[PDB]
Design goal:
Chain B: Belongs to the RNA polymerase beta' chain family. Chain B: It comes from Escherichia coli (strain K12). Chain B: This is DNA-directed RNA polymerase subunit beta'. This is part of a larger assembly, with two copies of chain A, one copy of chain C and one copy of chain D. By secondary structure, chain C is an alpha+beta fold. Chain C has a domain of 116 residues: RNA polymerase II, Rpb2 subunit, wall domain (OB fold (Dihydrolipoamide Acetyltransferase, E2P), Beta Barrel), CATH 2.40.50.150. Chain C is built from 35 helices and 64 strands. Chain C is globular and about 125 Å long. Helices cover 60% and strands 0% of the residues of chain D. The chains are: A alpha+beta, C alpha+beta, D mainly alpha. Chains in contact: A-B, A-C, B-C, B-D, C-D. Chains B and C meet through helix 3, strand 1, strand 2, helix 4 and helix 5 of B and strand 58, strand 63, strand 64, helix 32 and helix 33 of C.
Chain lengths: 287, 250, 1340, 153
């Protein structure tokens, strides 16, 4: 509604303003009275599959697990590597940025001291042991799970992890009822999986879709991630040390170009008029 | 079974069995009568339909209704669905040694709950019977029942030490997560409402606006030990979902 | 002002004048039932309409018929009081007079051969009490009105159902009042389909052809014509200019001498304008443009008479050549358009497999009744019965009106039968909607929803009963006798009474009427529900039927509704809402004539509200001239905007008209969030009456209305002077101007003392008047259960402080005083009824006696020799109210107990103790016992003493009525002799007996004397007969359920005080639970020493957003300050003039308050009484949206010598030092809610067990255990406590030999576990095994 | 079944149409079937005949008087003792169900409100055990001959 409730509760409300607010009040109340039934159904469905998850071994001795990376993508970092790996167990001899500096013999409990040691270094990728990778038959092993969260020590055998998992992810169900690229901070403009090519102006342009814009700080870890589509134009090259507040990439959100990576004569080949193409000329430009 | 007012009550299975065996006897009579084939076919189809309704009423054809114009429930209707034996009688079960009361605020310690004295003698009643027999105060168990019915001073003098070091579970429906069930060490209060420690209200998602509380008393040594070791509110400090604490002052 | 208004005047802060007073609140029920009761010979409403709908009814052969003549309701045999006492429905017999007409086939018109006139009885019709409720089986019950989709035609649409295309699929819908339903639907391929009663879709040509419609005329009705001409060389086409709507010109359009649109070019409006200019109609067309068009008529050649091209066939070039050579220049073709006239009907004929009417009827029969072979006549009979039979189809007047209005027809009246024109018009309207002209209507619009009240469903059930009767009369007349058949013996009254009884009591819409408060009464009788027969269900209802539609404004309040799953399905109509003659809600309004707001009131429905613009009640009127501002806020078309003075057509009657009655009682509503206002209004209905009612200091002004409209108070019918009162009776000598010249003219008001409610609460009325004071018409006499001097008073009001106190109000908890407990501000009385039934078991009849085995005489001290507790005997939990003995069957004697019998020698006789005991934890006093006994069985001496007490009471009250009636009748009995001569020397001197023997005179006095003698003969013989009837009725045997001998009812009165645990709530959604009881010296006090008695959490205000409680607290402080000053100056008695001056100064405080109360007209005694009444604190009225601003509160606090800020410093009661910051303290109206703590207290160690599954029962009433649901099982197995789970699943509930030994070894002090197989698994095994599938256990 | 039983009983030589004779047998078959079957608790044909007569007579009384027929007043029409009328009215009980929705929603059937009145209370079992122990010890406190004679008696 365009007319706002200019009044407040200290000054009271008109009859019209009260009637308008009642719409939203009833909407919210009905949504609350309705969607938690679906939330309870979802919790029951979740707890049904995870009945048999009970820790059975301590170490299944499995191979490599899964990679771990922060959430730097999209915009600013939401959750860093500090809390995404707190309580996990590594799978390989993960090493510090200085070569041949190993802190774990393929498995250790990443309690607070190890998190501090890791964040002190410039490590950004750690491979930890996950439940999906566990090789235990008819259950999971304790080391493939990680330390318990209610206690803080390594989880002991016999504890039913599926039920607590389903309950924990079903509890908040009620509460959840409802062209250009600009750099923000100083860093290194890094292009990953880039098919680089030079435009007519001598700058750098892109000819692929599997390329991502990365912001690398002085330490080496990636801070910001951005998406660049195929056939975009970049105002800066690769490996450029620049500060934030600069529009580096420009592309038309509507026009999608077929830019040719090579240079040479362009003669019209295999376009015969009247069968596949039509003769149309611009009425203002003439080109 | 007979009812108090001289009436009767029965399951619909009696109706379905009567129907199927009536039609089976009629078919048996028809066979030896050398009846025309169309009538015998009609009777066989009627038997098929009757057995079909017995096994699953509203599955093949129209549901057979009783005298109240409601569909008769088959014996497959009462093992399936929300109201069946599996969900209503096997997974979730009515329980003994339990009570309910409104919830009020506590000065209380974190491991204690305020249990009304009027409820305590009822919940633990066999325990008072046994302890009072052991003390030799009443000759027989029926005498002890008389004493607990008179509420003499001795029954309270036995209660205050029966409850001590005997944890008691507290339940607040709906139990969204594992913290909805916790064990507290009872303390006896003159009143009618369950006194709850404010620090656990956040975990219970309970406010003092008329919410109820279900109370359960563990019986065996193993159950009391499990309540003391795993279910005590002192043990539950951090949520199982994630490491942050759950006893934050609200 | 009325006389009893002078005794307490509530200050009103309302600014805008009140134009229309609030209507009678129960009119919605009273008028609806009145229409069902009264006889309307010309009207069709109620019993007359129901009878004339069925009657006359004729036999199958037509040789006889029944003619309904008239009907009459007999006098109800039992009054409401004895109906409630004896547990019988309050009803009256239905007597109907009807006729018999007999026809004979020997004479072509032998109509008159035999006639039968008699009055036959059928059915019992429950009556409506004066208060607008019903009494069914001795229990108070009300029927709520239903809100259902109105009969008529509605059109709908689809939003993304077809994901493949995303098109919008419009559909039409015909829903009659009763009968089969008809639906018209579209398809993504743009074809028309029909559905009957939600069956499979069928092409629409089927229903067209079923009405004897050929293809030619169908196409003519649903399309236009294209003229085709051949001038022996080329094709001439007659062009309509308004047909080329911007399409592509396939060929080069030309004219007589000009060419306009080239090939493959668009046609812009300039070409059509030029075509209109030059007026050229005939244009030449090529063959290529012609192929692709469909013909509109069959064509044959007259040379041989064979078909050339059938209708609805797309012709081609060879077809054109054939038509040309056959000599057919005149050709007509359909007009197809992609934008305005789609070929939906043409496509439908393409999909149609049928060809003639018989095929269509056969297809309809096959669709409706699959499997049964079709028949030549059965198909047409079924089709006629679908929509063209009065008995099996009806649209009703409302349905016909809505149908015609949606069809844009001018007719209002019509027929309830469908016609071909009706279906054709509906289809044409749907096709127009699909094309784009017209708009699909809205389903939850209040113009499309109808209110069905109790009279309507009652008449519907009566129609069902008459249909049941006709089902048997049709055969009874056909097969029965022709001459000796009396109509009485051939009719049956069981079906009609059965149907009406099922509706009254076994239906969903009739439920027990809430009786906690008069407000609960009003808000339950003024209730609108969307459930029941023909309505939604909570599981089915979605969102559109729950949200607040913009048309609810002024008809249905948006604040008062349940918070559960049915939040949008149960509503309550607003204060001023009414009902059309059709059943549509409308709201009053004030007409505006050229900027002048005339006071005449108009009622507009929802459909008419959108046409005009309505100025809201926030506008200011400049002395019946114009408004204050040039631009005035209004609402139109469901939206709000700003309009000039002249545009305004209507004005809201009052600012109170949006909210309902229950939500209107909240003061300062406009300062409350809607969420909390909803819960406050809901909780307001759950208040419990207290020992003494306390007026709300901060009210709204409609308490005086709801209290007198509830009917719980004794209102004076006729004005007069009070002559004599008691605690039970009030008599008034009516003034001479209301004395009818025929009767005494003295009224009796018999109060109702402590009586059980439906919710076990006390009802009493106490006289609020004194001896010898004047009373007026419509004036209150006795206060109701929760009323104070005629004003509704749900709860009490006392000091309240907003401050956190040691955590005792941690989370919405309440801290309460010991002082409030001492003065019983919340003590409530509860009345319980306990029934002891004695039946005749086959082992022997049960007996009620004081002789009971193995019971000490101490427990029998409260029983008389007859075994019944004395009246007034205080009884605690566990005592024996009535001693009942049942014969004991043969009992097996084990070796040990028979050894004991041999040792001690006692023998148990044929006796078993089954006496009624007071349930545990209940203590009270027996206030009444009632004994009913079967006819034939001898009555016990207790029953005899009750009977003689009732006899003496009946005699005494009949005689007292005699004295009252005659004390006024003497004003005519004596005065007639006084007429024609006063004889005061000898008339008054002689006793009244010696008054008819006065001096003899002419025959006129002889006629007067004989008339008076006849009157005295009446008096003699009108009153011994009724005494005899009452005596016979009391001593008459009581009809009881078969198998019982006597029933003893015992009434228990429980006085319940406040405890930690009881639910306390305010009027703003701020509920709570009493946490602890605080000593009086333990709580905060101000410098004056007065301690606050309620302490509330300040933190509950901001997040909850209910600010109205702060304003109410400030008003309470101001009002109590005014009362304190008045009381302080009254204790000294300065001067009556000084009191008058101060009260007058306190009564004019607002800027432009409506009322101007002047005390100069009050006498000294009148002023002193008024000051005494408000000595406890002057009460203040605050309308919902015209309340006092903060400025008035500040002025009132200044008047009372109170701080402007509204907060003062308090000192802690424990340590005694001033708090750091000022704390707001005032008077707030608390409520005592029905959620007591002892009613929710429960605990169970070991008790009853269910029968089929051997598990403990549930519920406090049957001493059931708590339910350990599956979520808590999940929680335990998440903990890992396997042993607690094992005991919770085996030894707690379903181990028959497990729980017993667990009991035994717990008693022996050994808490050892012995598992077992649950019985609930054994029943599952036996059930699966009995289903035909093997199930076993693989043992080792 | 009745029609089959009537076909052979019928003879053309009687000079009557088949329907007249077949209607009697069909009515008898249907009435007997409703008599024996159609009730959870079977009632003999005699007593259901009597209850049908009571229903007809009560309808006839209610047609004229308009009030319920008094059992004392029913003896005049039935010409049989008023105790027989009460006995007849006794058995009119028809079983209802175990799943009648006693409450308002589909959550509380009548089967959940039915108590098992055939189980001894655990207190009674405990008393029996205590009594057994008391008797055992008190008999151990006697002479052997007396103890054995009391037990074996």
């Amino acid at each position: 509604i365009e007319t706002p409730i200019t009044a407040n509760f200290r000054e009271g409300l008109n009859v019209l303003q009260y009637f308008i607010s009642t719409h939203g009040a009833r909407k919210g109340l009905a949504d609350t009275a309705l969607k938690t039934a679906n939330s309870g159904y979802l919790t029951r469905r979740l707890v049904d599959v995870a009945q048999d998850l009970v820790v059975t071994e301590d170490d299944c001795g499995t191979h490599e697990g899964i990679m771990m990376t922060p959430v730097i993508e999209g915009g600013d970092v939401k959750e860093p590597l500090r809390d995404r790996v707190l309580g996990r167990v590594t799978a390989e001899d993960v090493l510090k940025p200085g070569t041949a500096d190993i802190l774990v013999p393929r498995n250790t409990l990443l309690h607070e001291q190890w998190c501090d040691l890791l964040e002190e270094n410039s490590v950004d990728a750690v491979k930890v042991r996950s439940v999906v990778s566990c090789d235990t038959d008819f259950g999971v092993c304790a080391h493939c799970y990680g330390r318990d969260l209610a206690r803080g020590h390594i989880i002991n055998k016999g504890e039913a992890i599926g039920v607590i998992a389903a309950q924990s992810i079903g509890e908040p169900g009620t509460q959840l009822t409802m062209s250009s690229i600009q750099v923000k901070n100083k860093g290194s403009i890094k292009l990953s999986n880039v098919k680089s090519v030079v435009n007519s102006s001598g700058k750098l342009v892109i000819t692929s879709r599997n390329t991502e814009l990365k912001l690398i700080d002085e330490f080496g870890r990636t801070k910001e991630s951005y998406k660049v589509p195929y056939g975009a134009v970049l105002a800066k090259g690769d490996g450029e040390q620049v500060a934030g507040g600069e529009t580096v990439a420009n592309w038309d959100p509507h026009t999608m170009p077929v830019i040719t990576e090579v240079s040479g004569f362009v003669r019209f080949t295999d376009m015969i008029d009247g069968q596949t193409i039509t003769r149309q000329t611009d009425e203002l430009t003439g080109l | 079974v007979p009812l108090d007012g001289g009436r009767f009550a029965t399951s619909d299975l009696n109706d379905l069995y009567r129907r199927v065996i009536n039609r089976n006897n009629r078919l048996k009579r028809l066979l030896d009568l050398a009846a025309p084939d169309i009538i015998v076919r009609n009777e066989k189809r009627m038997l098929q339909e009757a057995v079909d309704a017995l096994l699953d009423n509203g599955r093949r054809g129209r549901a057979i209704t009783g005298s109240n114009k409601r569909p008769l429930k088959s014996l497959a209707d009462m093992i399936k669905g929300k109201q069946g034996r599996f969900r209503q009688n096997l997974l979730g079960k009515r329980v003994d040694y339990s009570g309910r009361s409104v919830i009020t605020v506590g000065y209380l310690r974190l491991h204690q709950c305020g249990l009304p004295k009027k409820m305590a003698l009822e919940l633990f009643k066999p325990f008072i019977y046994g302890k009072l027999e052991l003390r030799g105060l009443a000759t027989t168990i029926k005498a002890a029942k008389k004493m607990v019915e008179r509420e003499e001073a001795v029954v309270w003098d036995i209660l205050d030490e029966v409850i001590r070091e005997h944890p008691v579970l507290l339940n607040r429906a709906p139990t969204l997560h594992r913290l909805g069930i916790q064990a507290f060490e009872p303390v006896l209060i003159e009143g009618k409402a369950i006194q709850l420690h404010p620090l656990v209200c956040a975990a219970y998602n309970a406010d003092f606006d008329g919410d109820q509380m279900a109370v359960h008393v563990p019986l065996t040594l193993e159950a009391q030990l499990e309540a003391r070791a795993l279910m005590m509110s002192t043990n539950n400090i951090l949520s199982p979902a994630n490491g942050e604490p759950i006893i934050v002052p609200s | 002002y009325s006389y009893t208004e002078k005794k307490r005047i509530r200050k009103d802060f309302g600014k805008r004048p009140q134009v229309l007073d609030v209507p009678y609140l129960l009119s919605i029920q009273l008028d609806s039932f009145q229409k069902f009761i009264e006889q309307d010979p010309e009207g069709q409403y109620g019993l007359e309409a129901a009878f004339r709908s069925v009657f006359p009814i004729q036999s199958y052969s037509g040789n006889s018929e029944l003619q309904y003549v008239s009907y009459r309701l007999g006098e109800p045999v039992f009054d409401v009081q004895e109906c409630q006492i004896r547990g019988v429905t309050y009803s009256a017999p239905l007597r109907v007079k009807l006729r018999l007409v007999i026809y004979e086939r020997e004479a072509p018109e032998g109509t008159v051969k035999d006639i039968k006139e008699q009055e036959v009885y059928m059915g019992e019709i429950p009556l409506m009490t004066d208060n607008g409720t019903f009494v069914i089986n001795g229990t108070e019950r009300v029927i709520v009105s239903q809100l259902h989709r109105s009969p008529g035609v509605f059109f709908d649409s689809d939003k993304g159902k077809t994901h493949s295309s995303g098109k919008v699929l419009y559909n039409a819908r015909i829903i009659p009042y009763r009968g089969s339903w008809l639906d018209f639907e579209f398809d993504p391929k743009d074809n028309l389909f029909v559905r009957i009663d939600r069956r499979r879709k069928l092409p629409a040509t089927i229903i067209l052809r079923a009405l004897n419609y050929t293809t030619e005329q169908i196409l003519d009705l649903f399309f236009e014509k294209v003229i085709f001409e051949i001038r022996d060389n080329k094709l001439q086409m007659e062009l309509v200019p308004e047909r080329l709507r911007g399409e592509t010109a396939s060929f080069d359009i030309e004219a007589n001498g000009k060419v306009y649109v080239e090939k493959g070019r668009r046609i812009t409006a300039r070409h059509i304008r030029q075509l209109e200019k030059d007026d050229v109609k005939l244009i030449e067309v090529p063959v290529e443009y012609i192929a692709g068009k469909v013909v509109a008529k069959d064509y044959i050649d007259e040379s041989t008479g064979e078909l050339i091209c059938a209708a609805n066939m797309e012709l081609s070039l060879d077809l054109l050549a054939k038509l040309s050579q056959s000599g057919h220049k005149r050709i007509e073709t359909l007009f197809t358009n992609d934008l305005d006239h789609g070929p939906y009907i043409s496509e439908t004929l393409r999909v149609d497999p049928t060809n003639d009417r018989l095929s269509a009827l056969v297809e309809i029969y096959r669709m409706m009744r699959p499997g049964e072979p079709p028949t030549r006549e059965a198909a047409e009979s079924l089709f006629e019965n679908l929509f063209f039979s009065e008995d099996r189809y009806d649209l009703s007047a409302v349905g016909r009106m809505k149908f015609n209005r949606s069809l844009l027809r001018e007719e209002i009246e019509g027929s309830g039968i469908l016609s071909k024109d009706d279906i054709i018009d509906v289809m044409k309207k749907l096709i127009d909607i699909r094309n784009g002209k017209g708009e699909v209507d809205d389903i939850d619009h209040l113009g499309n929803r109808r209110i069905r009240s109790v009279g309507e469903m009652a008449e519907n059930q009566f129609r069902v009963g008459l249909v049941r009767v006709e089902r048997a009369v049709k055969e009874r007349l056909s097969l029965g006798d022709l001459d000796t058949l009396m109509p009485q013996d051939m009719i049956n009254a069981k079906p009609i009474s059965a149907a009406v009884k099922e509706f009254f009591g076994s239906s969903q819409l009739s439920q027990f009427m809430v009786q906690n408060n008069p407000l609960s009464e009003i808000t339950h009788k003024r209730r609108i529900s969307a459930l029941g027969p023909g309505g939604l269900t909570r599981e089915r209802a979605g969102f559109e039927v729950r949200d607040v539609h913009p048309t609810h404004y002024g008809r249905v309040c948006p604040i008062e509704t349940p918070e559960g799953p049915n939040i949008g399905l149960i509503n309550s109509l607003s204060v001023y809402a009414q009902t059309n003659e059709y059943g549509f809600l409308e709201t009053p309004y004030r007409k505006v004539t050229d900027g002048v707001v005339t006071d005449e009131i108009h009622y507009l429905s929802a459909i008419e509200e959108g046409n005009y613009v309505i100025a809201q009640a926030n506008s200011n009127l400049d002395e019946e001239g114009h408004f204050v501002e040039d631009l005035v806020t209004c609402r139109s078309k469901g939206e709000s905007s700003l309009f000039s003075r002249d545009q305004v057509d209507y004005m809201d009657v009052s600012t109170q008209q949006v909210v309902s009655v229950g939500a209107s009682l909240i003061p300062f509503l406009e300062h409350d969030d809607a969420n909390r206002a909803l819960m406050g209004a809901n909780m307001q209905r759950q208040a419990v009456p207290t020992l003494r009612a306390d007026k709300p200091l901060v009210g709204t002004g409609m308490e005086r209305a709801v209290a007198v409209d509830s009917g719980v108070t004794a209102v004076a019918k006729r004005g007069g002077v009070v002559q004599y009162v008691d605690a039970s009776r009030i008599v008034i000598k009516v003034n001479e101007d209301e004395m009818y010249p025929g009767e005494a003219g003295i009224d009796i008001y018999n109060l109702t003392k402590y009586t059980r409610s439906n919710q076990n609460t006390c009802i009493n009325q106490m006289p609020c008047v004194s001896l010898g004071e004047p009373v007026e018409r419509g004036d209150v006499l006795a206060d109701g259960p929760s009323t104070d001097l005629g004003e509704l008073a749900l709860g009490q009001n006392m000091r309240v402080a907003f401050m956190p106190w040691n955590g005792y109000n941690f989370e919405d908890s309440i801290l309460v005083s010991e002082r409030v407990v001492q003065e019983d501000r919340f003590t409530t009385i509860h009345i319980q009824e306990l029934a002891c039934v004695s039946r005749d078991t086959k082992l022997g009849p049960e007996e009620i006696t004081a002789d009971i085995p193995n019971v000490g005489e101490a427990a029998l001290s409260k029983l008389d020799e007859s075994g019944i507790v004395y009246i007034g005997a205080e009884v605690t939990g566990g005592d024996i109210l009535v001693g009942k003995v049942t014969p004991k069957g043969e009992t097996q004697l084990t070796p040990e107990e028979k050894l004991l019998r041999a040792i001690f020698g006692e023998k148990a006789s044929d006796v078993k103790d089954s006496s009624l005991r007071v349930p545990n934890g209940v203590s009270g006093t027996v206030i009444d016992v009632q004994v009913f006994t079967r006819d034939g069985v001898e009555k016990d001496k207790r029953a005899l003493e009750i009977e003689e007490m009732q006899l003496k009471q009946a005699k005494k009250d009949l005689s007292e009525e005699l004295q009252i009636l005659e004390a006024g009748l003497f004003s005519r009995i004596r005065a007639v002799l006084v007429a024609g001569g006063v004889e005061a020397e000898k008339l008054d001197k002689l006793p009244r007996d010696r008054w008819l023997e006065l001096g003899l005179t002419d025959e006129e006095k002889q006629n007067q004397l004989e008339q008076l003698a006849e009157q005295y003969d009446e008096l003699k013989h009108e009153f011994e007969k009724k005494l005899e009837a009452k005596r016979r009725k009391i001593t008459q045997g009581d009809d009881l359920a078969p198998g019982v001998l006597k029933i003893v009812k015992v009434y228990l009165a429980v006085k319940r005080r406040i405890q930690p645990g009881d639910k306390m709530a305010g009027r703003h959604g701020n509920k709570g639970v009493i946490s602890k009881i605080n000593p009086i010296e333990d709580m905060p006090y101000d410098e004056n020493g007065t301690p606050v008695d309620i302490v509330l959490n300040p933190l509950g205000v901001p997040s909850r957003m209910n600010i109205g409680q702060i304003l109410e607290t400030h008003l309470g402080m101001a009002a109590k300050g005014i009362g304190d000053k008045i009381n302080a100056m009254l204790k000294q008695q300065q001067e009556v003039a000084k009191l008058r001056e101060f009260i007058q100064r306190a009564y004019d405080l607002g800027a432009d308050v409506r009322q101007k109360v002047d005390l100069s007209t009050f006498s000294d005694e009148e002023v002193m009484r008024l000051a005494e009444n408000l000595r406890k604190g002057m009460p203040i009225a605050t309308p919902v949206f015209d309340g006092a601003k903060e400025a008035e509160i500040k002025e009132l606090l200044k008047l009372g010598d109170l701080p402007t800020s509204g907060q003062i410093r308090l000192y802690d009661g424990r340590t005694g030092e001033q708090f750091e910051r000022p704390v707001t303290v005032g008077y707030m109206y608390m409520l005592k809610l029905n959620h007591l703590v002892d009613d929710k207290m429960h605990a169970r160690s070991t008790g009853s067990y269910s029968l089929v599954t051997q598990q403990p029962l549930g519920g406090k009433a049957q001493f059931g255990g708590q339910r350990f649901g599956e979520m808590e099982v999940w929680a335990l197995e998440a903990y890992g406590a396997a042993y607690t789970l094992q005991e919770m699943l085996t030894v707690k509930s379903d181990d028959v030999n497990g729980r017993t030994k667990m009991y035994k070894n717990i008693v022996d002090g050994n808490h050892q576990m012995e598992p077992g197989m649950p019985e609930s698994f054994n029943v599952l095994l036996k059930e699966i095994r009995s289903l035909g599938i093997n199930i076993e256990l693989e043992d080792e | 079944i009745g029609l089959m039983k009537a076909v052979d009983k019928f003879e053309y030589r009687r000079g009557y149409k088949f329907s007249t004779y077949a209607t009697w047998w069909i009515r008898q078959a249907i009435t007997r079937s409703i008599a024996d079957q159609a009730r959870t608790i079977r009632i003999p044909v005699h007593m259901i005949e009597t209850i049908n007569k009571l229903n007809r007579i009560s309808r006839q009384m209610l047609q004229e008087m308009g009030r319920e027929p008094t059992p004392e007043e029913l003896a005049e029409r039935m010409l049989m003792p008023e105790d027989k009328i009460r006995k007849v009215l006794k058995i009119a009980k028809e079983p209802i169900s175990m799943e009648t929705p006693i409450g308002d929603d589909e959550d509380s059937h009548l089967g959940d409100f039915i108590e098992d009145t055939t189980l001894e209370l655990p207190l009674d079992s405990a008393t029996t055990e205590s009594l057994r122990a008391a008797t055992h010890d008190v008999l151990a406190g006697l002479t052997a001959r007396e103890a054995k004679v009391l037990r074996m008696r």
